[PDB]
Every structure is written in structure tokens, then in C-alpha cells.
Amino acid sequence: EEFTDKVAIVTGGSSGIGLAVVDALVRYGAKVVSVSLDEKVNVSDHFKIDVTNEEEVKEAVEKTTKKYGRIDILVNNAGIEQYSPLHLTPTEIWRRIIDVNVNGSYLMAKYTIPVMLAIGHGSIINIASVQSYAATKNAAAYVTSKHALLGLTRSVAIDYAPKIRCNAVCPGTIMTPMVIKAAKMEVGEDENAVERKIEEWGRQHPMGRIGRPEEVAEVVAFLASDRSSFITGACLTVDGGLLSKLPISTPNA
């Protein structure tokens, strides 16, 4: 319990990832304030707001600071997806993904940084993706917004060291309801096709499975912790080896 007296804010807090991050941070002693589009745990407070709405972000951050007196940790985890290549992505959907996934993070960080400066220490963990380094097909706005998020990461880390560390977590496929929905979109519903498809994505990760939301949450907690006190501006992949794998088969002398 090393996060005792520390306050954490976590966005997309009713996500698979978000919920696991909330649970991991409460388990290590923090008070967690959760932010999401729903009313949807062990959070000390929940804010139902749109991270792209500046007045809403500002009010939430100020109510938190007023009530708890401090914010030590921000986890930017809010993010949406459109499965379209670029030229097939309508303008409002493009702008909206870049707005949610990039500007939402900027806005949270913008209002949260002053308090962390005031207080002397802070830790900002940006939940990005393996799509921050490489691209799947049909993910133009998503891949671009996750690349952005590392730039956002490296900038904050450079401008605010040593008081604030800022790092990115880059997950491969993580078991969440989104993953189920995507399988269902791709293959439909003949006998166990949905499950076989989730198992197949697992088989492309060198680990031969997909990740659990708590395995992401453990990495977030470590970055939030004094344990990682010389890591900042880093982009840690949690992807079961995916990004280091070349998918060219090879004989076996």
C-alpha cells in the first residue's frame, strides 16, 4: 500500500482497462476519481463528463482538487475507434476520434499539471497502443491518434521533469468487451467463430494469448509508483512480444 494518501484520476474509467487500473490503484492504497461517459466500483468519486469538453474537464479537476486537496496521478485512458481506412473515414468521425483520443488527453493533462507542480510530484500515464508504432488495416484515425499520444507523452515528460514524470503504456490486444465486439463484426456468429477469432489474435502474439486488463493495470501502477522514479518519456509496450515479432516463417535447421 504505497499509494496511501495519493489521489488518482482515471479516464475511460468504465473500460475494461480503466476498471482494472482503478482496481489496481485502489488495491495499492490510492483514492481514485474516475471519469467516463457513463454513470457506471471502489472509486471515491465518479465524474460523468466528456473529456473533450473543456468546461467539464476544468470543473471535474477543480472539484477533485477542492475535495481531496491533491492529484498525484493521471491515467489518460479515454479512446474511441472506427474501423475504416483513411479515405473511407467521414470528416466528423475523423475529427471526433482525434478530438477524443488526443485533445481529451491534452485537456486532462492541462488542468491536472498545475496541481502536480504545486505539490512537487506527479505521474501521468497515457494509455496508448501497439498501434502507436505500427498499423493494422482499417484503423486510420485510431493509429494516428495513438501515435499523437506518444508525442504528447514525450513533450510533457521533457517540459515537466523532474516534478512530473510522463510515460505511455502500449498494449497489444487486451481482453475487453471491445475485443468481443470487433471479433463479432469480423466473423459473425456461426457456432464458436467469435471465440476462435479471439483465440487466433492470441496466436499472433508471441505469448500465444491476448492480455488481461489487470496486466495493463500492473504496468500503470508501476509507472505511477516511486519504483519507476528514473523512467520518464518512455513508451512501455505490454503486447506479449507482438511489436518485436516479424511474421515471416522460417525453417528450422
Which residues form the catalytic set?
142
Rounded to 10 degrees, what is the CA torsion of 163, 165, 166, 172? -160
What number of CA atoms fall less than 13 Å from residue 13's CA on the CB side? 31
| 158 burial type by CB count under 10 A (0-12 exposed, 13-18 middle, 19+ buried) | exposed
**Taking the complex as a whole, how short is the minimal distance between the CB of residue 95 and its own copies, in angstroms?**
7
Nearer to its own copies by Cβ, of 13 and 213: the residue is: 213
**Taking the complex as a whole, how short is the minimal distance between the CB of residue 4 and its own copies, in angstroms?**
18
Q: How far apart are CA 224 and CA 220, in angstroms?
A: 6
- The residue among 159, 236, 220 whose CA lies nearest residue 32 is 220
Nearer to its own copies by Cβ, of 44 and 184: the residue is: 184
**Taking the complex as a whole, how short is the minimal distance between the CB of residue 29 and its own copies, in angstroms?**
16
Nearer to its own copies by Cβ, of 14 and 145: the residue is: 145
Nearer to its own copies by Cβ, of 8 and 182: the residue is: 182
For residue 253, what are the CA distances in angstroms to 142, 163, 250?
41, 53, 9
**Taking the complex as a whole, how short is the minimal distance between the CB of residue 5 and its own copies, in angstroms?**
21
